Amino acid sequence: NVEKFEGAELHVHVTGSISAALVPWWIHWLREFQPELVVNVSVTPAASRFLAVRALRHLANGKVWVDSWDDPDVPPEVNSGKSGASECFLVFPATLDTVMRLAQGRADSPALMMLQLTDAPLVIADTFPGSNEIVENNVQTLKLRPNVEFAPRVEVGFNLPGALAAANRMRKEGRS
Amino acid sequence: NVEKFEGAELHVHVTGSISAALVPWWIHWLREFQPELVVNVSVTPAASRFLAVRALRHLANGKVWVDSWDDPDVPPEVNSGKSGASECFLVFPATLDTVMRLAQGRADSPALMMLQLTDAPLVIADTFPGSNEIVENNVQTLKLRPNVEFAPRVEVGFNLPGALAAANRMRKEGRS
Amino acid sequence: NVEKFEGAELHVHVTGSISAALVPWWIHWLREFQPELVVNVSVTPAASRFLAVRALRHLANGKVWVDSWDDPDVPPEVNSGKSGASECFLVFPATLDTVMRLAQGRADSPALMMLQLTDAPLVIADTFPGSNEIVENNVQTLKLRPNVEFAPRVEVGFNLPGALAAANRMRKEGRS
Amino acid sequence: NVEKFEGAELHVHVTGSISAALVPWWIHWLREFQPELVVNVSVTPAASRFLAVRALRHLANGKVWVDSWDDPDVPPEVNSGKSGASECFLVFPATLDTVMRLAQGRADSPALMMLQLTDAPLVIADTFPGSNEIVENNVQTLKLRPNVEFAPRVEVGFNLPGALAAANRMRKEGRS
Amino acid sequence: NVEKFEGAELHVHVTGSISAALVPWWIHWLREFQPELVVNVSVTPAASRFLAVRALRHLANGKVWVDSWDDPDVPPEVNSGKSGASECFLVFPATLDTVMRLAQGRADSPALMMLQLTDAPLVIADTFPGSNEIVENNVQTLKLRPNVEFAPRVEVGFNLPGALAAANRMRKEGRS
Amino acid sequence: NVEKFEGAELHVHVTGSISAALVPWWIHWLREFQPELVVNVSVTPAASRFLAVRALRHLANGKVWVDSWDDPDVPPEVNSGKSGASECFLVFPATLDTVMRLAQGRADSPALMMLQLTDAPLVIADTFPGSNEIVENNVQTLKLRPNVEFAPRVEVGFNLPGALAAANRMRKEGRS
Ligand SMILES: Cc1cc2nc3c(=O)[nH]c(=O)nc-3n(C[C@H](O)[C@H](O)[C@H](O)COP(=O)(O)OP(=O)(O)OC[C@H]3O[C@@H](n4cnc5c(N)ncnc54)[C@H](O)[C@@H]3O)c2cc1C
Ligand SMILES: Cc1cc2nc3c(=O)[nH]c(=O)nc-3n(C[C@H](O)[C@H](O)[C@H](O)COP(=O)(O)OP(=O)(O)OC[C@H]3O[C@@H](n4cnc5c(N)ncnc54)[C@H](O)[C@@H]3O)c2cc1C
Ligand SMILES: Cc1cc2nc3c(=O)[nH]c(=O)nc-3n(C[C@H](O)[C@H](O)[C@H](O)COP(=O)(O)OP(=O)(O)OC[C@H]3O[C@@H](n4cnc5c(N)ncnc54)[C@H](O)[C@@H]3O)c2cc1C
Ligand SMILES: Cc1cc2nc3c(=O)[nH]c(=O)nc-3n(C[C@H](O)[C@H](O)[C@H](O)COP(=O)(O)OP(=O)(O)OC[C@H]3O[C@@H](n4cnc5c(N)ncnc54)[C@H](O)[C@@H]3O)c2cc1C
Ligand SMILES: Cc1cc2nc3c(=O)[nH]c(=O)nc-3n(C[C@H](O)[C@H](O)[C@H](O)COP(=O)(O)OP(=O)(O)OC[C@H]3O[C@@H](n4cnc5c(N)ncnc54)[C@H](O)[C@@H]3O)c2cc1C
Ligand SMILES: Cc1cc2nc3c(=O)[nH]c(=O)nc-3n(C[C@H](O)[C@H](O)[C@H](O)COP(=O)(O)OP(=O)(O)OC[C@H]3O[C@@H](n4cnc5c(N)ncnc54)[C@H](O)[C@@H]3O)c2cc1C
């Protein structure tokens, strides 16, 4: 049930769960599955303790940068909600904290400024250890944004093929 | 009116108010008052400017760690809302900022992940310099969590004996 | 339509937008326009990448400090919502993130503790790259505080003369 | 055609090719495929530029160490050709240089001392960019050691399932 | 049986026993018990591993300095046996080593120069792990100095109320 | 009386007076006043204590570099008296020391090599604290160079509009 992303370029935002260690394998998979796709990647300091940014610079064909206002590779168009010509944004994986920061309008990292300002489909491949009533409320708050969805389950949302299908879906709804 | 904590182990989370300087005296008090109790302690970077973690490693009989995702002493069970076999969690003292972060579902430190995920009684010995309408709303938000209480007053909540009584109370309510 | 601030001392809190590079010119302007005024200045780490704190120590006649709990110049009265004898507080410029932190009751910097605790007129000279529904909600939340206003427009609020007029206005309303 | 390793514990030695970025995914796979297996892992400085040792400490249930005589995690039994109770050794992936060093009797890293001294099945999942006559001669030299094999092809030998089958094969030949 | 110190200012010299962790609580106690008293504090490098000098700068109303010839806060009057206008000197707590250094006329720290040169009452709140014949001889040697006493017991001398009573006693004997 | 610079590109050399703090405002002004103009900027180490080079990289559309032989951004054409295709050179502001170094043929910074070798109009927006007979002689020495002028006064020469008019003037004299 695995389908191709119908756009030309997407952006992957990688956050600090142990699943980030598995992302270079999935980026490699997506590059072989769809060689014409341009894949940009942002990586949080936390995630950079679980993978090597250097390896992504090799596996990914788009821009690769650490999600930090002091990193010189951070492209200027983050301040307009863009990543090159990315047509969707996948948070893969997405920590509890990254989702709380998104739900709260925070722009304390250039990737979060970018995710606050984008109108493009934004898919969240959540990897939460757990939840409570206050977390669930902050997740509900994200329905105020029409472009945001959580990826299809596999109880956890670490699901790139599902994220790609959800993205192609929200892309075609944005045209008709 | 001072009573013993009826569990076997608790956890003390120390945050960056000048009252943190007084916590080693209170930990020493609790160790003499109740020698069979296992006391775990987490200390925020801020609080570590007002006390010495080394002194707690001596005064406390449980695990002691700095509240930072890079500290190697951070136990893995924080990601399941546990601290060893702690049966309650005392934030002693609790800054305004720690309480805002808790009220907002933040997990940007392993102690906050832990406090988000625990079902055990969570008592907050607040030391706020002051308040406003937005702070009061964020404090109200904590009533969505049944396990959270503020410690009995002494206008400030820097009250370990009261916290222990409140904890034994919420522990027995959780059994009947 | 440019009028003088009718108080004796104010405080300028400078945050990390490229407009911070232009603040020393405006501080110099305010010092020549109103030589009797004492101007205190706080500068966020981010803003300190776009201007030099040293230059403000020369151009400003009040206290100048980096907005960090470890800076030794941070005056103790931030923990009572004061900056010397400042009678208003201008966030000039104000990032999206600084405004979200204010709207959320955060005290994770001494300037934010100060801005949470003050009753004085607080004017926000916002420089947002953009917005969404969740940001707009967090901006609405600031109406729970009677002393907070956004400066008059020039779509952006980087407007010191307007901020000064708004401040004198909220000052006289607080007396009658 | 994927079969389980018939021993209790093995050792994975990871070397500096971009394929090392994909090893945490394969370690995760082997841990789920065979939960009773103890997996030890050594990682060369070079490979540590393409993956995070920290992530392996989480994904692997055995000892994890950097292949350096100064790393304090290096177990003493490397000087007897052992890694805990490992019953085979997989070089996954194996650089040209690691294979030249092995072919030349080098012990300039504790993993290479270990691989020189072991009698256990040693499988080499080579990832060479290319070859020449002198490289091919050094690869032939490894036939002087009865326990050494190259993994089954998939032109490249980055093949853990094949390596496991080859290992179970050389293990049973060593008993009969 | 707790009485007030009858002078205007005293000096507390804190040394490297785990009891130093408890001194900020006792300084806080003395400041509330006797708000008019000016309390100066010196802290040895060793003691600074068990408490935070920063916390004492907040809790103490007099000068606070690290006991080191390179610390810029060290007041010049240590070279005349003074600490501001301190009328007594409490070594609280006092290590075995600090007492040996005092007994031997050592001035290898500015606090020890100060304690060698003072004529004011000097009270020693010893916290020794143990003793031998040579230690006891060095303690006897301190009777050659009329101003030196050990604080009343509670086997250990970690006793600020007793030290204060002993100090008021030796102060009035020095006048009649 | 404010006129546009009639060339396509100019270079601004910023030196270590407190007026350097005001240059980003003036660069912003010149970019809005004349959007087609390419503005290159060099900044002395001293001036970099009074402004942020990073802010100029954003406000200026040409090359921006620190005036140091070790800065990698220093363009090679400084050794031919050029800055890209700059048609004039404004020292804005100009310290006493920068003007002495220029008057004395010094090339101890790449900007000074550049200013020694250029034939283009060179305008000096001096900010001297004061003068003496030897300084005045060194300023007279600059009349040996036909391309050098001091900007029109406003007693001080911190005057970009005047500098631009003087530059267009010396440009047209160099053609007729
Ligand atoms: C082994 C392990 C597994 C984990 N698994 C999970 C998991 O499955 N799910 C999960 O939700 N969490 C997990 N965590 C916890 C997670 O790593 C933390 O919550 C972490 O803070 C997530 O950060 P991030 O990648 O979302 O963003 P980051 O950018 O790393 O966030 C760091 C924080 O610092 C702030 N910050 C901004 N600028 C700076 C700066 N200049 N310097 C410092 N801080 C700055 C950010 O605003 C943010 O609050 C795990 C942790 C460990 C150790
Ligand atoms: C003398 C004094 C007395 C004070 N008294 C009080 C008081 O009584 N009550 C009160 O409420 N406040 C008080 N404060 C202010 C208080 O210290 C600050 O609000 C402080 O930020 C509290 O931090 P914390 O201990 O709650 O948590 P911390 O963990 O110290 O929080 C630090 C912040 O950094 C973020 N962060 C996460 N990861 C990182 C990282 N890797 N690097 C950097 N930052 C990171 C955290 O999310 C958080 O926002 C006082 C301050 C001083 C100087
Ligand atoms: C060229 C450029 C232009 C920009 N223009 C704009 C603009 O116009 N508008 C806009 O809204 N944004 C803009 N930004 C983005 C802005 O700089 C960031 O959002 C930045 O985080 C703003 O920080 P601040 O000055 O508000 O506060 P800061 O104090 O700098 O906030 C830093 C973050 O770190 C946390 N923190 C607290 N203590 C510590 C500690 N000890 N160590 C580390 N972190 C800590 C704070 O809580 C906060 O979340 C721009 C960025 C760039 C590069
Ligand atoms: C993007 C990329 C992809 C690559 N892909 C491949 C590939 O597919 N196949 C391939 O064969 N190569 C590849 N290489 C090259 C490979 O990374 C180098 O050959 C590297 O030296 C391999 O080292 P190692 O991991 O085998 O062992 P290392 O232990 O990293 O070897 C480092 C060298 O230093 C010596 N040494 C020992 N002790 C020390 C010490 N204390 N300090 C310093 N040096 C010491 C070792 O003996 C050895 O000679 C690639 C390189 C890059 C950048
Ligand atoms: C957990 C723990 C508990 C302890 N409890 C006790 C206790 O209860 N009682 C007890 O007596 N001891 C105790 N000790 C031991 C005590 O900490 C040491 O004896 C320590 O040396 C005491 O130093 P001080 O604070 O007296 O003075 P310090 O000033 O710390 O003495 C350090 C030594 O270095 C010398 N020195 C001078 N200048 C310098 C310099 N620039 N650099 C380096 N050294 C210099 C000093 O002359 C002195 O000899 C304990 C130690 C630990 C770890
Ligand atoms: C608050 C303040 C205001 C001031 N206002 C004025 C003012 O209005 N007018 C005024 O004329 N002066 C003023 N000054 C003084 C001025 O900053 C100094 O004269 C300063 O040296 C000027 O340097 P520059 O920017 O001209 O060049 P710089 O390049 O900073 O000159 C530094 C010196 O170091 C030499 N040098 C070369 N290479 C190196 C190297 N690698 N490392 C170190 N040094 C090297 C240079 O040749 C030169 O002599 C002020 C100073 C302060 C603190």
UniProtKB/Swiss-Prot annotation, chains A, B, C, D, E, F:
Keywords: Decarboxylase, Lyase, Oxidoreductase
Pfam families: Flavoprotein
Listed EC numbers: 1.3.99.36
The reaction(s) this protein catalyses: [cypemycin](1-18)-L-Cys-L-Leu-L-Val-L-Cys + A = C(3,19),S(21)-[cypemycin](1-18)-L-Ala-L-Leu-N-thioethenyl-L-valinamide + hydrogen sulfide + AH2 + CO2
Biological process, per Gene Ontology: peptide antibiotic biosynthetic process
InterPro entries: CypD-like, Flavin_trans-like, Flavoprotein
Broad EC category: oxidoreductase
Domain of life: Bacteria
Cited SUPFAM superfamilies: Homo-oligomeric flavin-containing Cys decarboxylases, HFCD
Any one GO molecular function term: carboxy-lyase activity
Protein function: Involved in the biosynthesis of the lanaridin cypemycin.
Family to which this protein belongs: Belongs to the HFCD (homooligomeric flavin containing Cys decarboxylase) superfamily.
Protein name, as recorded: Cypemycin cysteine dehydrogenase (decarboxylating)
Species the sequence originates in: Streptomyces sp
Lineage of producing organism: Bacteria, Bacillati, Actinomycetota, Actinomycetes, Kitasatosporales
